[PDB]
Amino acid sequence: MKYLPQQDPQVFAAIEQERKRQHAKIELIASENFVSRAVMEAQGSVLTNKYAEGYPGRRYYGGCEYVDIVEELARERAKQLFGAEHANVQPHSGAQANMAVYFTVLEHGDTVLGMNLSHGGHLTHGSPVNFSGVQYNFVAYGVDPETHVIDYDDVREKARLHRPKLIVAAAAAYPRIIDFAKFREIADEVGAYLMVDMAHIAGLVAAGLHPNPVPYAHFVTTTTHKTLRGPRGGMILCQEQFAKQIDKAIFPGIQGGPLMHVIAAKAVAFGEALQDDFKAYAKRVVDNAKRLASALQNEGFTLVSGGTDNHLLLVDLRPQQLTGKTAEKVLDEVGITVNKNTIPYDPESPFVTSGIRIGTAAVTTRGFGLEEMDEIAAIIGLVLKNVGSEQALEEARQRVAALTD
Amino acid sequence: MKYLPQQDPQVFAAIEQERKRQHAKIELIASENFVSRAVMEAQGSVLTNKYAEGYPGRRYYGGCEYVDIVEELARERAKQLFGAEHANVQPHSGAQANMAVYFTVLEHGDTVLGMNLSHGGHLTHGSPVNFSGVQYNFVAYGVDPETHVIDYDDVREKARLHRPKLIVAAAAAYPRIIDFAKFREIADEVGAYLMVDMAHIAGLVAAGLHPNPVPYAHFVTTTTHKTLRGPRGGMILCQEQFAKQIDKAIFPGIQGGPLMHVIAAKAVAFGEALQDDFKAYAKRVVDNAKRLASALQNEGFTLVSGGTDNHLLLVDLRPQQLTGKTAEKVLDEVGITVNKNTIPYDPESPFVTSGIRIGTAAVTTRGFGLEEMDEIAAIIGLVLKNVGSEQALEEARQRVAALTD
Ligand SMILES: *Cc1c(COP(=O)(O)O)cnc(C)c1O
Numbered sequence: 001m002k003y004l005p006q007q008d009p010q011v012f013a014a015i016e017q018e019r020k021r022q023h024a025k026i027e028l029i030a031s032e033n034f035v036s037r038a039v040m041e042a043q044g045s046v047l048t049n050k051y052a053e054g055y056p057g058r059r060y061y062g063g064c065e066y067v068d069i070v071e072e073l074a075r076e077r078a079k080q081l082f083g084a085e086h087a088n089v090q091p092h093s094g095a096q097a098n099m100a101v102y103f104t105v106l107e108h109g110d111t112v113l114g115m116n117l118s119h120g121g122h123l124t125h126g127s128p129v130n131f132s133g134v135q136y137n138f139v140a141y142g143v144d145p146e147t148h149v150i151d152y153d154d155v156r157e158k159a160r161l162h163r164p165k166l167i168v169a170a171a172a173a174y175p176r177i178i179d180f181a182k183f184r185e186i187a188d189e190v191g192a193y194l195m196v197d198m199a200h201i202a203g204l205v206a207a208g209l210h211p212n213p214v215p216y217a218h219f220v221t222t223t224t225h226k227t228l229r230g231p232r233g234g235m236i237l238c239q240e241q242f243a244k245q246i247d248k249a250i251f252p253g254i255q256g257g258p259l260m261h262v263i264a265a266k267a268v269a270f271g272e273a274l275q276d277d278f279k280a281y282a283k284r285v286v287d288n289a290k291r292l293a294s295a296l297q298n299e300g301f302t303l304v305s306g307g308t309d310n311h312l313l314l315v316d317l318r319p320q321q322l323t324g325k326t327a328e329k330v331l332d333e334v335g336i337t338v339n340k341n342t343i344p345y346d347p348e349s350p351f352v353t354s355g356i357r358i359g360t361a362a363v364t365t366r367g368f369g370l371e372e373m374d375e376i377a378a379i380i381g382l383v384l385k386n387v388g389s390e391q392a393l394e395e396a397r398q399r400v401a402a403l404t405d
Numbered sequence: 406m407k408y409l410p411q412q413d414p415q416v417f418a419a420i421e422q423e424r425k426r427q428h429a430k431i432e433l434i435a436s437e438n439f440v441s442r443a444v445m446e447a448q449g450s451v452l453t454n455k456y457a458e459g460y461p462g463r464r465y466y467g468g469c470e471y472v473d474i475v476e477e478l479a480r481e482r483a484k485q486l487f488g489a490e491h492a493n494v495q496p497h498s499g500a501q502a503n504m505a506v507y508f509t510v511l512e513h514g515d516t517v518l519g520m521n522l523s524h525g526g527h528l529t530h531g532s533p534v535n536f537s538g539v540q541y542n543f544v545a546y547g548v549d550p551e552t553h554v555i556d557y558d559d560v561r562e563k564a565r566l567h568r569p570k571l572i573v574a575a576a577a578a579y580p581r582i583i584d585f586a587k588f589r590e591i592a593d594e595v596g597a598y599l600m601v602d603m604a605h606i607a608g609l610v611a612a613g614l615h616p617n618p619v620p621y622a623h624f625v626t627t628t629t630h631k632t633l634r635g636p637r638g639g640m641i642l643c644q645e646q647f648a649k650q651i652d653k654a655i656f657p658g659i660q661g662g663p664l665m666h667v668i669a670a671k672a673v674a675f676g677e678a679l680q681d682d683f684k685a686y687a688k689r690v691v692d693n694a695k696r697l698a699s700a701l702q703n704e705g706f707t708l709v710s711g712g713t714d715n716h717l718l719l720v721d722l723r724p725q726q727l728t729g730k731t732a733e734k735v736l737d738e739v740g741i742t743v744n745k746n747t748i749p750y751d752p753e754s755p756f757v758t759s760g761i762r763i764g765t766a767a768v769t770t771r772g773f774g775l776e777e778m779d780e781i782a783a784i785i786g787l788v789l790k791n792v793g794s795e796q797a798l799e800e801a802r803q804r805v806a807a808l809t810d
Pocket residue numbers: 031092093094095096098122124170171172197198199200223233234660661662
């Protein structure tokens with residue numbers, strides 16, 4: 001940076017602390033990643049100066065010729081990446097992408113069926129403190145108590161009983177492949193739309209390492225960040241038949257001016273994802289997750305669903321008589337970043353929990369591989385089996401430092 | 406830029422076109438501005454990598470120590486700038502700031518009283534194609550047919566007849582000072598909350614050149630861009646008594662993860678606004694607007710309300726037998742950027758209009774002063790009085806080029 005250090009020492013000092021923190025810590029929060037310098041440059045551009053309400057070639061303001069090129073690059077690259085008929089790259093966030101889809105097909109108080117929040121569902125899939133749970137009548141399907149895999153007969157029964165207008169598939173904390181064909185079959189049986197919220201797995205979908213929801217879903221929502229490794233923001237994919245309605249839902253429906261600089265950064269990220277090396281990256285993410293899962297089991301940890309098919313895993317800490325909160329806290333002391341997370345049928349509140357969620361997208365971006373997964377698992381074992389030993393925690397701290405340099 | 410040109414030639418070429426366009430054109434769109442290099446650097450930072458759902462010291466994820474410093478810098482600087490008891494700097498946009506306030510105090514179908522959209526009100530103040538008009542029962546107050554100033558007796562009568570839960574004051578296209586004391590008096594009479602949407606005038610408020618709504622309003626919403634000259638995004642100000650509810654409305658209410666890099670940029674912009682030179686800038690904005698208004702009247706143009714108290718003016722084109730659409734188009738041909746805009750009691754649709762809206766915030770940032778205002782007015786006169794003369798348009802084009810170098 002050149003101008004920020006002189007103009008705002010306080011803000012610069014804090015940013016520099018954060019940059020150094022990002023390097024020093026082992027980031028295992030499953031939603032996190034590190035974007036490229038090109039992506040950052042794009043959103044640090046003069047495009048922040050441009051109002052561009054509307055869509056390419058159909059804007060409310062003049063002078064949009066070049067931001068139109070940028071937005072269409074984003075849309076076309078997204079369509080190639082996911083094989084979708086339409087893309088809307090304007091959502092400010094994953095939350096706003098979902099909000100727009102809900103606004104498109106639902107009336108206030110309509111019934112929606114989503115994944116149980118305590119089993120892996122997202123806040124925006126019907127939390128009573130979120131707009132989704134307040135505005136619409138959410139009901140939940142669950143995972144099997146033993147296998148922790150989505151119970152598709154429960155999805156079907158809930159759908160047939162409650163007759164939802166919309167079914168939501170997709171999760172914030174589900175370690176297995178989701179069967180979108182079955183979701184669509186159930187949706188078809190009850191005459192409901194299917195929305196897939198692929199935020200966590202979008203990068204894996206792009207790389208062909210998770211089944212693509214696009215052919216099965218009426219609407220697909222996603223973050224552009226997370227496994228897709230893009231700038232912070234949202235996106236909606238859908239068939240041509242819903243394009244006009246979806247576009248109107250985003251604007252003038254729920255948003256105002258789009259963030260054109262962030263949209264530029266989205267284009268950059270989609271460009272990166274189209275490359276062969278991104279596919280190699282995404283395979284390492286999945287390989288690393290399997291390896292880490294196996295290595296954690298080797299340490300004696302129990303994993304929700306017995307492993308992982310994707311970038312993320314959930315440790316059930318009950319065998320160690322630990323809460324997620326306790327584990328999260330002690331790992332923070334040694335430089336490993338995780339988050340506490342409810343496990344299916346958790347006896348604890350969502351604020352304490354019996355689990356920690358772990359993902360490999362961030363460490364993989366940093367170039368970590370299988371050997372590093374083994375060591376990460378060994379450090380976690382050392383820490384969680386010795387929570388009262390400062391000597392053990394110091395050893396862990398040093399081993400974490402050795403990994404990050 | 407260093408990395409973007411190599412990684413993504415297509416995106417870079419388009420960004421460069423936009424940057425050159427921003428320099429070449431005379432930007433008179435009233436909502437537009439040019440942010441500092443420091444602001445851009447802040448939002449081009451690694452803070453995009455951090456999930457920070459929640460609030461400073463009360464986050465859902467670990468590792469937020471430094472983004473907490475950034476967010477608190479934003480909040481504290483906003484509070485000093487506007488004398489507010491609480492700030493929420495997380496809204497993704499002006500639309501989301503409004504959405505959050507509505508979510509805080511209103512139930513689905515509650516009555517809200519806002520400014521007539523065709524008289525200066527914003528889309529998010531009850532358009533039937535916007536969430537506001539769909540989710541809530543909006544009624545409108547108008548401006549006087551002759552003076553084009555808000556008719557405060559009409560505000561009062563509408564309030565007393567319709568008994569709104571919330572009254573909204575603030576505008577996208579109103580050239581005069583708004584009397585917030587009168588709005589609060591009316592709100593008090595009918596037991597309604599008062600929300601002031603100060604997006605357009607926030608920079609002028611910060612500089613003490615427009616009365617501050619903060620002491621009179623329960624809630625104040627704003628963009629961080631526009632006259633405040635910050636990054637693209639939103640903000641809410643309110644008294645301590647609504648702080649917890651407002652914060653919950655933003656998260657987990659309507660948004661997910663905040664844009665921490667944009668919040669850093671907000672802090673930078675607020676820092677800039679706190680400086681003496683920003684106050685000088687804002688006075689030049691207002692001075693320039695008056696001068697431009699006077700110079701346009703000298704050219705024979707009629708202005709809505711007969712002039713301006715702020716950064717913006719509206720030309721009533723009916724005396725010239727021109728629509729806003731026609732004027733917008735021909736000005737685009739010579740390098741002057743305006744937008745068509747409905748005038749109060751417009752005989753034309755909002756898609757054709759009888760007016761153009763003009764603001765001075767952008768040209769003032771570029772260092773334009775009174776002499777430039779005279780010339781801009783003279784060029785507009787030349788163009789709009791000679792719409793069928795290619796020679797006149799070429800002269801205008803050359804004169805525009807002389808202004809921008
Ligand atoms: C992360 C996530 C979201 C929310 O995205 P934000 O950008 O944080 O608003 C929504 N749904 C799912 C499944 C997610 O994983």
